[PDB]
Amino acid sequence: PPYTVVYFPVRGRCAALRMLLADQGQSWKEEVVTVETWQEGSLKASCLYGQLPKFQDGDLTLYQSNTILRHLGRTLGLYGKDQQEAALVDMVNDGVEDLRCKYISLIYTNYEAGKDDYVKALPGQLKPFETLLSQNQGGKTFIVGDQISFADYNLLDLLLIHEVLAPGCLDAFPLLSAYVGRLSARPKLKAFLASPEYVNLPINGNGKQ
Template identity: 90%
Template sequence: MRMLLADQGQSWNEEVVNKETWLQGPLKASCLYGQLPKFQDGDLTLYQSNAILRHLGRTLGLYGKDQREAALVDVVNDGVEDLRSKYITLIYTNYEAGKKEYVKALPGHLKPFETLLSQNQGGQAFIMGDQISFADYNLLDLLLIHQVLAPGCLDSLPLLSAYVARLSARPKLKAFLASPEHVNRPINGNGKQASNPVC
């Protein structure tokens, strides 16, 4: 969400909730599903990361040019979330014992995204269509995280590697990725991979 907002030139106010405040209970009790993020857009309150991303996609014109592209963007985003679920399971339940096998299987999990890129202007555009979508930001986030987990994980995937470099070089996004607000934010809440990549 932050990368999308920054790259699209949007301003936002962020309230960072520390563990102590969260454990006090009232904020958690006020959240629809008892979890963050919580997103305010005027009088609209949203929960769930992907609902927020889709809202931003619709609001900012980042959801494909038509219904067909929108459907394909959804396919990409759901694929990103499938891999993110595997990653979260590793990080929070099986990091020490499972990392080696996870990294070994990672190229196979990333291959569908390489395939999608190859089918869209030879991998020289975005993940779907010729305009950036909310799914591009979600995929980029996941790929940057995986480059911290397993440097070189994109070495056998040249289109994805170039895609990460190309998106990360977008001026507003590049500035955000280099900002202290991004660099100093832990990737995971349990301290695994405690520093963000600087691109």
């Protein structure tokens, strides 16, 4: 550290890493980039892939939401106990990313006409995570192993935003439901999730959720 998050005024792809930093008692600065400033062109041109989030860890500058998650996971010890668990953590995170991409596609490019098919396909997209929990200590701990990992924060956010998109989508999944309640009750995380810093930001940037 110190840490700096450069992003638009939305939860979006920074929600998970923010929950991670908060829950881990880490301090960070938020560099809010408005759409007007972004349309100016300067910042965008300076970004490796022309996109945000941009992240600063001391003299290290990173791009890509999952790179930031993996970096924090690596440096803060939120990546499993060994190589085998690290691979499982990646497997979970990549699955979370795949569904997040589908969610993003729906939200920004086909909300009106595609929501119905998306919601109907949702149960089948969520079950893999319920299954993973079922195979790990009866789903009483974390998504991988017995310690929290960066994938837990990413999965938690994925679940929270889907409950908004399709209320009750976790009702058929007891382990996932209990998991969300358990993680959300962690002291620092609970405080962060209740803060206006989180609550007063829209999930996405187009007013849809």
